[PDB]
Curated annotation (Swiss-Prot), chains A, B:
Pathway: tRNA modification; N(7)-methylguanine-tRNA biosynthesis. S-adenosyl-L-methionine binds at residues 38, 61-62, 96-97, 116. Its EC number is 2.1.1.33. Forms a complex with TRM82. Keywords: Methyltransferase, Nucleus, Phosphoprotein, RNA-binding, S-adenosyl-L-methionine, Transferase, tRNA processing, tRNA-binding. Methyltransferase that catalyzes the formation of N(7)-methylguanine at position 46 (m7G46) in tRNA, a modification required to maintain stability of tRNAs; its absence resulting in tRNA decay. Both the D-stem and T-stem structures of tRNAs are required for efficient methyltransferase activity. It catalyses: guanosine(46) in tRNA + S-adenosyl-L-methionine = N(7)-methylguanosine(46) in tRNA + S-adenosyl-L-homocysteine. It comes from the Eukaryota. One of its GO terms (molecular function) is tRNA binding. One of its GO terms (cellular component) is nucleoplasm. Belongs to the class I-like SAM-binding methyltransferase superfamily. TrmB family. This is tRNA (guanine-N(7)-)-methyltransferase. The lineage of its organism: Eukaryota, Fungi, Dikarya, Ascomycota, Saccharomycotina.
Swiss-Prot record, chain D:
It comes from Saccharomyces cerevisiae (strain ATCC 204508 / S288c) (Baker's yeast). The gene is TRM82. Required for the formation of N(7)-methylguanine at position 46 (m7G46) in tRNA, a modification required to maintain stability of tRNAs; its absence resulting in tRNA decay. In the complex, it is required to stabilize and induce conformational changes of the catalytic subunit. Changing residue 171 to L: Decreased tRNA methylation. Its main location: nucleus. This is tRNA (guanine-N(7)-)-methyltransferase non-catalytic subunit TRM82. Forms a heterodimer with the catalytic subunit TRM8. WD repeats lie at residues 1-46, 48-95, 96-140, 141-185, 186-227, 248-294.
Amino acid sequence: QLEYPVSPQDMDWSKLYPYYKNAENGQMTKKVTIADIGCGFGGLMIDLSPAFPEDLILGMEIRVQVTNYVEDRIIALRNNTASKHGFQNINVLRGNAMKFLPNFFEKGQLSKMFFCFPDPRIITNTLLSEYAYVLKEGGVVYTITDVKDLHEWMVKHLEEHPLFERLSKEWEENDECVKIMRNATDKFVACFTRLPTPAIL
Amino acid sequence: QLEYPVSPQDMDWSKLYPYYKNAENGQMTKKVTIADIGCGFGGLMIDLSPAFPEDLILGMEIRVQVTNYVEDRIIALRNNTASKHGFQNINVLRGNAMKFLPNFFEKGQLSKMFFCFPDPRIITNTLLSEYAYVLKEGGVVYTITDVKDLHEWMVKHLEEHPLFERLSKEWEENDECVKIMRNATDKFVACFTRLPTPAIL
Amino acid sequence: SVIHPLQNLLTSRDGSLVFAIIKNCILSFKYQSPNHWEFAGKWSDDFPIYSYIRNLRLTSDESRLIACADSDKSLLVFDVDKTSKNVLKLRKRFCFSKRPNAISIAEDDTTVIIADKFGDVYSIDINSIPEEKFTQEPILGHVSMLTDVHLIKDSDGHQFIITSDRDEHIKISHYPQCFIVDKWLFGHKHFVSSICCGKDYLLLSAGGDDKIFAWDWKTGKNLSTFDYNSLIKPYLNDQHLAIIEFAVSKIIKSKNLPFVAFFVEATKCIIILEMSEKQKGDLALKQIITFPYNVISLSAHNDEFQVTLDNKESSGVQKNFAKFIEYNLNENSFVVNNEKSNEFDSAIIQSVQGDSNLVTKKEEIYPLYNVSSL
Amino acid sequence: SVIHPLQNLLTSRDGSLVFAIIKNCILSFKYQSPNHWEFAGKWSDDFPIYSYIRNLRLTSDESRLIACADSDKSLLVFDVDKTSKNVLKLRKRFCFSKRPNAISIAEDDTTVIIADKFGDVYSIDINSIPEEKFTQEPILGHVSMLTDVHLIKDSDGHQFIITSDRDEHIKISHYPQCFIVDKWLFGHKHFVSSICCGKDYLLLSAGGDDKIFAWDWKTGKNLSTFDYNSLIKPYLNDQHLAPPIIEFAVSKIIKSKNLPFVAFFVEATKCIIILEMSEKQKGDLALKQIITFPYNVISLSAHNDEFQVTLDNKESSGVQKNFAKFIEYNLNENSFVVNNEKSNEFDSAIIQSVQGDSNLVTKKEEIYPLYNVSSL
């Protein structure tokens, strides 16, 4: 049985990210800002951790065994570390991104969303509207797979949705996230910017 | 002689936008977020004012007679008003956007930049990098002119700059800012998203 | 020999036309006061497995009537002859891959919003020719089961579609720009079964929760909640055994009066709250109305509520198929119109006899309690 | 008959090669201590109107020397023969639409960053063949006049180009991703003329302002400022009188290579001021010494831990002396001191390298203007 908040504002993040709890206020000093959708065994997260030390990164997986594995994995990383902050910005929870994203994240909360080696649909014309909701204007969707068909599927829906625009190969070659993606345990990549919403005042 | 700040942090905004000064703190409750580059007689600002009541809007003009005209104009609007907030979010200053934008605005501070009926260059491959600086990721550049040649000039440089992407006609038809633009005293329009900067970590 | 209970009523705007769902059939009746009911036709669906009919809706000009057929996963469109002896003529059947669950007609009065069992929402132009094989993508979607749809409009004429689901969500999207989610209303701890839209952005929602929720939907703010637990408790029976589990089945608004009615599934009452004129969103109990059987459907026509009852197990002469509740200005209270109701029972009995389909064994009666399954 | 004053010196890394600008010419001299100067060639620019030569720079391998020719709006590339009697061979001329004003060689040691008079910055591969008509867009640009360029590198090997301008800006951009402005350093009230880069992100800047500015350029924070007004005041003359009242400007600020010293000079004064960089608190400056000369300082350069100065000796009498000074640090005395022998022999080497040439030895009014930073 999944655990998820009644609203994003009811979500207690101080248990997953205890290092960013203000001891005085009892408040969070930081918010989750990067999301790994289908994080699997947590590799991409591990590599993102030191690359984005100012950012809270959350992985989501639906498989229970896999999430328990990852919890233990990061707990270890945290204790096997010298500094008082090593891997403190990274964590996972068991959850269904296709359904409850808006329970966890406020509107425009995330800067980045990763879908790396998705299982041959978390990408759908219909699901994209919900992702657009939690991803800020200017935020990006990162995509890597070894399945050509899967890559072309992801590309077609992202490009057809009015709220997403593909980033150029030149952009990818300069982006650190793309490098980290390409180096996480025949690789087709696509990235997309979350376009600003047309003003309906 | 132009007056501009030594740094954005030294800028006192409480004189242009007195209604957003916290009487207790002596602090600004809001920041300038929309910019009309070459605001002329202030028409577009007047129309933006009630459409974006939560937003501080600044017009910049280099012509001194025109700025004095606009100062008096908005002062009037402010007093000729019932509410305690009418046109309180709009103002102008004499300055050179081609040179001192970074003196007034922090990095990624603005959400929107308007260049409406620019004089037949405030748009240049070289100037675009500075605009990219003060315009947040996801922010937009709005463009309208009656000169076909001018429109194609603006379009070429915006589209060639790696940090800008044209928004679709579908996007424009849904956007309030485009309507307000098209209705401010043969109209070619182009709009651009400030793309996210490739991460050079 | 028992007559299949009525599943729903739908009253035309003037009140002279009433439509009823029984099993896979729609009966039309014409009405003139005081209490004259004339049978005006029977349409039957001619396509375990229960051929449900649901969601009767009249277009604005009342030229046509629409509904959903489960047998067919279709949107039925009927032509409505206000004069004919048989009032309904089935003229179209728009088929879908998953069965429609809720519908709403668009402002244009020609576009129908269909929300299906699987979470997708489609639009259909009822003027268009039914495509033999259905070929168009959802306009938007949830990954949970969709519970209700409402097209809705702000002051500026901007359209929004509100969809609710089995996973406690109330989503507000732009229409026709459905790729843009406006917001969600957060607060429900349990599935949401019913929404109704009020004045000045007031919205009311209910379902598995213990409370009725009030929102300003422009604001997105939850104005307040009304706890009805200490009211239906006495009405709960051993059909609420799952350990106490109950759910609002429908919440609906009077058209001019500041009143809202709803019913909890498998109880024998409807509860009527008053909407505060002083502070928008504030609710207070006004009245509870009890009936000889479980309420099975709840509807409103102007300032009257109609109710339909599960009278499967009466004895002798089968009575109490429906009730018409009217507001009594003198008494400042809602009261059943027994004459009009009783004559209706009479008109029902004689409209339906002969039909071996509608009058049948008690176990050959479609399941009547279907909101608890969420 | 007066010899044109020297505009600049550039000393090779070991100290044995010295280059000098005079008018439209570059002279090379070879050096061996104590105080032996050998003439090693003269190149002249063979293209109101003053054919300035500026910005002498040696590649890292010292195989080539680059410079800017105003006559031509060109980037000159010379081959450098450490053995030949004539050391310089002009081998390329890269022409531009506006004249180069400042240059910096990239980390690759083959790409040259040219900042022009109009505010554009170009890159040039010196290995490439000079295109007869110039055809490439700026890499970045300001709308004000560009004052200085420095390629620079953070710990991670990331490159930045730092550009300063006539409108008080110091811009820091990513390189080669020049479409991305990293930040600006804010503080100057007046044009900035000169920047020099130090250790651990320390940057020093100067110009029209009353103070030398110290920054951490990664941070972008202004660490502190050093007010030098109560030092040059006595040195100010009626060349600091400003048109239709006291106006002066730092012309160049430069760093010792190993010692914690910074030197600079105010245009049309006869001194250089030397500050010490605090080892205790980064960015903190304190006066160390002022060195006075018989004439106005016209250029300021550094070779390892020594400063060279060049002087406006247009108006000497009899035997023209004091063209340049070599200042060395004396560990014993804890102070900077002119090396008179080496300087004096240099004057001697200059006099005999240049005589005969009617171009370099000429009327006093036929001497290129020497004070060009006040015009900002």
